């Protein structure tokens, strides 16, 4: 199949405004949220129907208990960081863990943390070590690496457990995750630029580009973002500016899910 990824996020806020949760945890398969938990509901809930239909209530009961424990642990870790940064006010602590099963069968795994939305600690499961960005992170790094068993544990989880969960979730939601809706592609003009617009496609992974007389023009092209249309499909665009003094053969190229497409502007 195509490349797929599973990743879990945590967010902790030290002094949140009234109502806003102190802790939020969301999991994703590719772009799809699958799980959610926060300090307000204190329940772990599915965020995809195919997760709700395939995981029995004892699963959500168990992970509700785990997330309540991890919520308290995250609060303690954020308290430690902010005191050691000597920081006042509200600050954020984030975590991301997960893995990719690539098309060719190889795998990747990652685990990292952020403070105030910037890299803080990054795990290297091949050297079994943490990369620290400053001296507050360095202190944490020393503590986490003194426990060699915890490093081995995370390496095993990234390389074995994460990949096995992902394969399981891929089967559950295969009607969603493994489908293909090809893009509808058009070109129009909007001093003057050609816009190549695609929409109605899934998966969101798409490559659009312009070529001039057969050569690519990377430095001259404006790339739009891949945006959700709201119905489970996506849209994207790419524009290029027209030479008013000399004609050229411009063509839009779109690659999506193994099919290549060319729109030559006449």
């Amino acid at each position, epitope marked *: 199949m195509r490349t797929h990824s599973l990743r879990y996020f945590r967010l902790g806020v030290s002094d949140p405004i009234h109502g806003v949760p102190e802790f939020i945890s969301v999991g994703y398969v590719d772009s799809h949220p699958i799980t959610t938990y926060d300090s307000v509901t204190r329940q772990k809930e599915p965020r995809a129907p195919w997760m709700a239909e395939n995981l029995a209530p004892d*699963h959500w*009961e*168990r*992970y509700t*208990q*785990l997330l*309540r*424990g*991890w919520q*308290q*642990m995250f609060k303690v870790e954020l308290k430690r960081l902010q005191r050691h940064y000597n920081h006042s006010g509200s600050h954020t602590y984030q975590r991301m863990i997960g893995c990719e099963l690539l098309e060719d069968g190889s795998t990747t795994g990652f685990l990292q943390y952020a403070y105030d939305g910037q890299d803080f600690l990054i795990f290297n499961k091949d050297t079994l070590s943490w990369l620290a960005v400053d001296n507050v992170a360095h202190t944490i790094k020393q503590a986490w690496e003194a*426990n060699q*068993h*915890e490093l*081995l*544990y*995370q*390496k*095993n*989880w990234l390389e*074995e*457990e994460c990949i*096995a*969960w992902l394969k399981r979730f891929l089967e559950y939601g295969k009607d969603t995750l493994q489908r293909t809706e090809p893009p509808l592609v058009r070109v129009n003009r909007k001093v003057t630029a050609l816009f190549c617009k695609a929409h109605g496609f899934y998966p969101p992974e798409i490559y659009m580009t312009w070529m001039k007389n057969g050569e690519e023009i990377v430095q001259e092209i404006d790339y739009g973002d891949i945006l959700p249309s709201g119905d489970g499909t996506y849209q994207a665009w790419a524009s290029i500016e027209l030479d008013p003094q000399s004609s050229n053969l411009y063509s839009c190229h779109v690659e999506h899910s193994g099919v290549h497409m060319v729109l030559q502007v006449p």
Partner: antibody
Amino acid sequence: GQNIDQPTEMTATEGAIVQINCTYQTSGFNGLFWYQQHAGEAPTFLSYNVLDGLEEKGRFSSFLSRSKGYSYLLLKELQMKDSASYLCAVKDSNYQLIWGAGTKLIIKP
Amino acid sequence: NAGVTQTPKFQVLKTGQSMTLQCAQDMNHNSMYWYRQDPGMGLRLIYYSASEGTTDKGEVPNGYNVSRLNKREFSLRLESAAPSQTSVYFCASSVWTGEGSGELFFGEGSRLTVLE
């Protein structure tokens, strides 16, 4: 469904070597623990393995093969004080411990 | 300090009688567990407490209830003792739960005999 097996009882001679086996069939794997429990007392932690290979720790070494679903606790130069039950426990995919029934190690002086 | 302290060490019970087993830990742990140990089988979890302020059932919760009074204490309640609850009960704690390689620290154990 989820299953761990170890021998009920083993008998070896003082000063010899004994290898206590633990096989497990589980949904997922997050580590294998060995605990020592003297008769009438509490279990105490001995070792942890989560990757393949052999870890040493004094007279005790613990081995793990994840593909075979197999571990052993190796006790060298047996002494009378090694007479105890040895419990193997595996953490499954939801981080829940599945416990073996334990192996009673009898040492002949 | 003391580690895990559970009481009583021994108890005889008549069928239908109530009983509370106490357990405290002074290691600043967050997760606490109640196990029963019976001949010929592995430890079975009765109830557990992943952190202060939350508890949930284990493998064999029927006939028991628990209370995570605070961060230190986790009591086990037998409301109506049954002969099948004759067993050795162990309370344990760990720093966290789901933090991968953390081990359990056990109390001394409580031996219960329920008689008709």
